[PDB]
């Protein structure tokens, strides 16, 4: 019994551990040679006590003087090489001591560990025993590749030392602070000894033992690679042995080596992700892309018929009880995120960002039937709502390829539109049998794989293919917009009700594809003379919705807040009257609210305001292609007006966020005032905070948001002038309200141009502004620099229109 209500345990007069503690004492091994098969047996008993969580014994060993010094003393010995006849009970002894160290550092979470152990791990690092045992578990893995096909007896003890060394090193990354493994040169040696020491076991494709040990070290290699992807300060030493490991792993059985092909592709993706690289660098790139695409043709065909046997074996059940542990025969679904198919697609999608002209990759895919092979499996996956990770990964590879003229023509010539257009209808289609909605939409990432994500990537792929191929993908884009016409019209409206960031990310691609397609207005009007006008109307309401939300920044904050907290119904209401007072009293306790809540709500609000601004910019450009150009409708009187709709109503009322309110010239005047106030906050946030490090991309976001804010204003002014001339010409628009239009726009374009000229006399981000900026340096004539007062074209064009309204 303890003074503090705890129980003490002690090694009593008949404890077995008194004899175990003598058998391992270095300071009696100075006197009585404990032969290694007996030291092994004493250490095996200590491994079981640490495995089988007998902590009432472990506590009573942790408290023994010299325990960790005597117990670890064989790890401070030296061994003969594997080519000399050492006693394998010593290899087991060292492997079992490594297991005890692993279990103790894992269970005794980062604090309560013994100080003689903490300074023993420190001693192991100072004596560089990491580098010694690294070199030994390297050479012992070459020796197995040199002695398989002989009756090499100690192979089980060799497997025990290789598995114990794997366990020790994954703890020496995650607990590097307790293992004292903080020398990046020793980490680089440990990585290369695990790389070479994996290669030797994977270049023997006939040896089940080498394949097993090499696949187990490949599990270590892949962890060390990711935890050290800042200290492996060269890439080009790693790619060679990974190609040699791949080409060995492709000469061996798929049913074992699935669980190695995946690890090797996962390593290659991680290595390509460390450095900006080109086809000039990579060892045998033209064979590596062959090896990867031929592996993908095992995988995508095995997935294709897996998705067809799931179409023949009808009405399996929701078999929901089985609390059972890691056994065989239960079937391998190939649509796993870490499956060889899905990792091969992502590796191909990294490698397609290294070959700039596509000229190296197309010299593989002119051999292999692979592009239509991917599309036929995608076509079934989309029809069945099966194979989500593969479906998304295939669309990622296609979206990478569609950027180059060689990749886009290869994707189009593979039949892309047929294998997506009708299958993709399934994805967003709902069942008409209405039942319960499951609220389990917990806070996962916006990059969690999803069926809406598959639709967004299909829209992004058609935005990309039409941007690259134009007239040579225009029928395909018209059939696609006509088939997807419901989802196109839904997503133009979804911003009116579902202001969530994942919905804004769908709407921007829908308006993006529309912005690529409205370049072909007369061709679109010939084939789809309904839908093009229904899109003009819904783009009009999307302009009203985005501008009223971006203006009403408090209503946007409230629409987020009122969809970020849940769970209480009540009704019936009625009224009125009064408190008060009072008691009382006491006591405690003190936590604070997190300012990180106001920071994260503001960061969500700034990202939602950026999403709404992208959509508004794309909408204002897409709508401009549905009006005659400002130059045409100013300068030619033979230009017809029946070819062009009224897209804005003759009001100057500011835009309400409001269900039926059609967009107006007051909506356009509000869009410019929104952009002026946002630009007018980006030149407030300029006070000198310091000592933060590591974020570059906020400089780029401060650039791209400012060029976007210009694009929102300037296409809005093009719509304003074009539609104002569309009203001022027209023979039915009443002369009273033509004169009203001249008057109310002559006032608010004058107030806006007075505000624009009060901004631009600071300089927009430009080469003239950068040339005017100097003062200690860079000056000529007296105090001038470059040349000043080159004006921006909007300030001339809106002047010319205001002058002509004042005629």
């Amino acid at each position: 019994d303890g003074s503090d209500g705890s129980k003490e345990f002690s090694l009593g007069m008949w404890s077995c551990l008194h004899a175990v503690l003598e058998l391992i004492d270095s300071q009696q091994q100075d006197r009585y040679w404990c032969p290694p098969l007996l030291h092994r047996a004493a250490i095996a008993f200590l491994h079981a006590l640490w495995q089988d969580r007998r902590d009432s014994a472990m506590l009573v060993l942790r408290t023994k003087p010299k325990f960790w010094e005597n117990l670890t003393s064989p790890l401070f010995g030296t061994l003969s090489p594997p080519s000399e006849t050492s006693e394998p009970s010593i290899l087991e002894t060292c492997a079992l001591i490594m297991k005890i160290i692993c279990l103790e550092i894992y269970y005794v979470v980062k604090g309560s560990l013994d100080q003689s152990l903490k300074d023993t791990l420190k001693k192991f690092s100072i004596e560089k025993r990491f580098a010694y045992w690294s070199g030994y578990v390297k050479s012992l893995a070459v020796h197995v590749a040199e002695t398989e096909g002989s009756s090499c007896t100690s192979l089980l003890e060799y497997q025990m030392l290789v598995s114990a060394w794997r366990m020790l090193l994954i703890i020496a990354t995650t607990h590097a602070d307790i293992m004292h493994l903080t020398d990046s040169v020793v980490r680089r040696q440990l990585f290369l000894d695990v790389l070479d020491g994996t290669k030797a076991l994977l270049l023997v494709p006939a040896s089940v033992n080498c394949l097993r040990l090499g696949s187990m070290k490949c599990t270590l290699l892949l962890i060390l690679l990711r935890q050290w992807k800042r200290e492996l300060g060269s890439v080009d030493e790693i790619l060679g042995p990974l190609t040699e490991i791949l080409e060995g792993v492709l000469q061996a059985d798929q049913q074992l080596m699935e669980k190695t092909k995946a690890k090797v592709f996962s390593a290659f993706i991680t290595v390509l992700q460390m450095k900006e690289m080109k086809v000039s660098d990579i060892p045998q790139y033209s064979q590596l892309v062959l090896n990867v695409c031929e592996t993908l043709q095992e995988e995508v065909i095995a997935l294709f018929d897996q998705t067809r046997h799931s179409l023949a074996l009808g009405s399996a059940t929701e078999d929901k009880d089985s609390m059972e542990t890691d056994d065989c025969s239960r079937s391998r679904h190939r649509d796993q995120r870490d499956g060889v198919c899905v990792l091969g697609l992502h590796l191909a999608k990294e490698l397609c960002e290294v070959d700039e002209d596509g000229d190296s990759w197309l010299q593989v895919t002119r051999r292999l039937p692979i592009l239509p092979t991917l599309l036929t499996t995608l076509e079934v996956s989309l029809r069945m709502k099966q194979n989500l990770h593969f479906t998304e990964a295939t669309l990622h590879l296609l979206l990478t390829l569609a950027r180059t003229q060689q990749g886009a023509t290869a994707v189009a010539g593979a039949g892309i539109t047929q294998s997506i257009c009708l299958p993709l209808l399934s994805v967003y289609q709902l069942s008409t049998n209405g039942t319960a909605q499951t609220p389990s939409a917990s806070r996962k990432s916006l990059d969690a794989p999803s069926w809406p994500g598959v639709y967004r990537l299909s829209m992004s792929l058609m935005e990309q293919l039409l941007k690259t191929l134009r007239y040579n993908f225009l029928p395909e884009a018209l059939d696609f917009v006509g088939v997807h016409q419901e989802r196109t019209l839904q997503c133009l409206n979804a911003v009116r009700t579902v202001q969530s960031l994942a919905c804004l990310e769908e709407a921007d691609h829908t308006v993006g594809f529309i912005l690529q397609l409205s370049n072909f207005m007369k061709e679109w009007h010939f084939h789809l003379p309904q839908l093009m006008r229904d899109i003009q109307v819904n783009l009009g309401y999307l302009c009203q919705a985005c501008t009223s939300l971006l203006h009403s920044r408090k209503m946007l904050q409230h629409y987020l807040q009122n969809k970020n907290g849940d769970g209480l119904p009540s009704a019936v209401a009625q009224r009125v009257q009064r408190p008060p007072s009072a008691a009382s009293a006491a006591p405690s306790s003190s936590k604070q609210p997190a300012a990180d809540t106001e920071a994260s709500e503001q960061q969500a609000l700034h990202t939602v305001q950026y999403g709404l601004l992208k959509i508004l910019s794309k909408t204002l450009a897409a709508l401009r292609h549905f009006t005659p150009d400002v130059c045409q409708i100013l300068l030619d009187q033979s230009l017809d007006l029946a070819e062009y709709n009224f897209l804005f109503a003759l009001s100057f009322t500011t835009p309400t966020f409001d269900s039926e309110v059609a967009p107006s010239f007051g909506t356009l005047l509000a869009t410019v005032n929104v952009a002026l106030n946002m630009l007018g906050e980006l030149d407030k946030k300029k006070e000198p905070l310091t000592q933060a490090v590591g974020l570059s991309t906020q400089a780029e976001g401060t650039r791209t948001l400012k060029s976007l804010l210009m694009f929102t204003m300037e296409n809005c002014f093009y719509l304003l002038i074009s539609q104002a001339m569309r009203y001022l010409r027209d023979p039915a628009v009443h002369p009273r309200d033509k004169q009203r239009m001249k008057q109310e726009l002559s006032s608010e374009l004058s107030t806006l141009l007075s505000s624009l000229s009060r901004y631009f006399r600071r300089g927009a981000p430009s080469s003239p502004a950068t040339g005017v900026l100097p003062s200690p340096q860079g000056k000529s004539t007296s105090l001038s620099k470059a040349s000043p007062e080159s004006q921006e074209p909007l300030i001339q064009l809106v002047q010319a229109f205001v002058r002509h309204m004042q005629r």
């Binding site: 080109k278 086809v279 000039s280 790139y285 070959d355 002209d357 000229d359 190296s360």
Partner: protein, 49 residues
């Protein structure tokens, strides 16, 4: 197409190596001619890059 700009470096570096070797040799009419041939080759590779 992609190989060609890796190869013109390696060919210039190798031509420089062979020209260091040749310029250590006893300067016979053959060593003089081949030093001319490799510098004529250099003076074309200096346009292939």
């Amino acid at each position: 197409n992609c190989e060609r700009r890796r190869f013109t470096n390696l060919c210039l570096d190798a031509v420089c190596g062979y020209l260091v070797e040749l310029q250590s040799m006893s300067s016979s009419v053959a060593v003089q001619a081949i030093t001319g041939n490799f510098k004529s080759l250099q003076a074309k590779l200096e346009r292939l890059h």
